[PDB]
Amino acid sequence: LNCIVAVSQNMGIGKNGDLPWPPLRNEFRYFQRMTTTSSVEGKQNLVIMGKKTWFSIPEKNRPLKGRINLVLSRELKEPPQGAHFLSRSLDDALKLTEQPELANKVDMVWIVGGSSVYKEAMNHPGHLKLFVTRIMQDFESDTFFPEIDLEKYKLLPEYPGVLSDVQEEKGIKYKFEVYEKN
Amino acid sequence: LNCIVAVSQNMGIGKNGDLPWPPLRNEFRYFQRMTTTSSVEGKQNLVIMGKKTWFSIPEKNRPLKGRINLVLSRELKEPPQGAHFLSRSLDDALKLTEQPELANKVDMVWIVGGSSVYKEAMNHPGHLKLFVTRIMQDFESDTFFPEIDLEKYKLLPEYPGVLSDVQEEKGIKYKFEVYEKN
Ligand SMILES: Nc1nc(=O)c2cc(CNc3ccc(C(=O)N[C@@H](CCC(=O)O)C(=O)O)cc3)cnc2[nH]1
Numbered sequence: 506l507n508c509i510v511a512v513s514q515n516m517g518i519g520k521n522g523d524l525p526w527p528p529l530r531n532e533f534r535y536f537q538r539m540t541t542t543s544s545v546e547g548k549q550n551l552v553i554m555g556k557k558t559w560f561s562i563p564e565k566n567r568p569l570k571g572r573i574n575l576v577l578s579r580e581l582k583e584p585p586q587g588a589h590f591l592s593r594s595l596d597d598a599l600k601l602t603e604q605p606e607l608a609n610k611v612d613m614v615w616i617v618g619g620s621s622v623y624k625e626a627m628n629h630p631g632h633l634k635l636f637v638t639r640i641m642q643d644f645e646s647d648t649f650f651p652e653i654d655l656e657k658y659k660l661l662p663e664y665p666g667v668l669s670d671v672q673e674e675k676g677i678k679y680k681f682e683v684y685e686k687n
Numbered sequence: 688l689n690c691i692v693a694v695s696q697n698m699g700i701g702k703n704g705d706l707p708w709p710p711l712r713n714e715f716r717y718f719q720r721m722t723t724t725s726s727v728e729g730k731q732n733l734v735i736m737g738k739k740t741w742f743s744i745p746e747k748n749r750p751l752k753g754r755i756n757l758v759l760s761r762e763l764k765e766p767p768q769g770a771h772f773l774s775r776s777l778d779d780a781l782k783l784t785e786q787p788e789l790a791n792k793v794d795m796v797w798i799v800g801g802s803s804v805y806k807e808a809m810n811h812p813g814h815l816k817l818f819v820t821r822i823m824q825d826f827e828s829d830t831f832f833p834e835i836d837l838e839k840y841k842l843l844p845e846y847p848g849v850l851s852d853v854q855e856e857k858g859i860k861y862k863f864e865v866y867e868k869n
């Protein structure tokens with residue numbers, strides 16, 4: 506279980522149901538590269554996300570491509586269009602990926618948001634990895650990311666695929682960090 | 688929804704976790720064809736059966752080849768070796784069925800028993816068909832097939848792919864029947 510997020514200096518992850526920052530095409534490309542790249546031959550990654558984060562993808566790249574898109578919601582009676590699966594819980598969704606028909610087709614599981622999903626997932630006993638993009642500037646948010654507990658999480662000073670130096674796009678600097686827990 | 692069973696004259700379907708009769712090679716040929724045959728190319732049929740059924744299949748005929756095997760178990764921890772999916776009630780299995788990625792891989796649904804399942808499936812709202820092979824002889828049994836509500840089910844005088852003649856094998860006579868409900 507991998508969590509993938511981009512957060513501002515203020516820990517905001519959202520505003521009005523959108524990234525509180527203007528589009529970083531490279532930041533996007535990387536998110537697109539991590540959640541897609543599967544380690545195993547012929548296996549696919551599964552992304553999980555709440556109702557809101559699904560509606561927040563530009564309608565034209567829904568469902569994420571080359572990925573199994575699952576959506577959690579206790580409300581929705583059926584998978585919103587383009588969605589691959591639907592679960593009411595993070596557990597139920599974790600179970601399902603445990604069905605062997607499934608298990609033999611999925612490699613990595615990535616949690617893409619929103620807030621309460623990241624919350625439920627961060628707590629979940631088990632081996633968890635947090636891929637966080639530090640967007641080094643404040644932005645006006647309505648939704649935030651939780652405190653990464655240092656009792657539990659450790660920052661990997663290294664990570665195959667991820668560059669260590671500070672990035673910049675449209676006068677915005679950011680850096681990719683990787684935390685782990687067990 | 689398709690249910691497929693064989694019943695002795697006394698409505699028996701099992702004796703000590705086995706069929707009450709000796710094996711009718713040509714009746715197992717029928718159940719096989721019917722359950723394995725899909726209308727669509729690149730789609731497969733799904734078989735749902737209780738745990739006892741699962742186990743009454745000769746362990747080298749497990750799981751049923753060319754079919755997605757699904758196990759109904761309230762307690763079973765994880766899915767028995769070789770089963771494709773595990774659910775806890777007909778309900779989840781069916782729901783499981785309407786999952787978009789699932790739904791495009793699966794053509795027909797067949798309920799292969801046991802008593803408790805047949806029954807739940809029989810009552811269930813919708814368009815249901817029972818495929819009944821009437822074994823024209825009494826056999827001591829411990830498991831009995833729910834009795835068919837004539838008020839709801841209706842015998843179809845013919846139905847494509849169903850031989851109309853009384854059959855006999857090993858001196859035993861049987862007949863193929865199909866019931867429908869709306
Ligand atoms: N690093 C990181 N960046 C994000 O932008 C991000 C966004 C979410 C949640 N929201 C979204 C919203 C839209 C798209 C999206 O359009 N993804 C496309 C974009 C790739 C591209 O178009 O260049 C994808 O194909 O992955 C993804 C996540 C979660 N974790 C993230 N994590």
Ligand SMILES: Nc1nc(=O)c2cc(CNc3ccc(C(=O)N[C@@H](CCC(=O)O)C(=O)O)cc3)cnc2[nH]1
Pocket residue numbers: 691692693706712714715716717718719740743744745748751752799800820
């Ligand atoms: N018509 C009918 N006949 C049955 O024998 C039957 C059996 C069950 C449950 N039990 C069983 C037990 C064994 C096998 C089985 O070995 N099937 C194999 C091989 C058939 C053959 O040997 O020709 C398969 O490939 O289906 C199937 C169902 C439920 N509905 C039925 N319905």
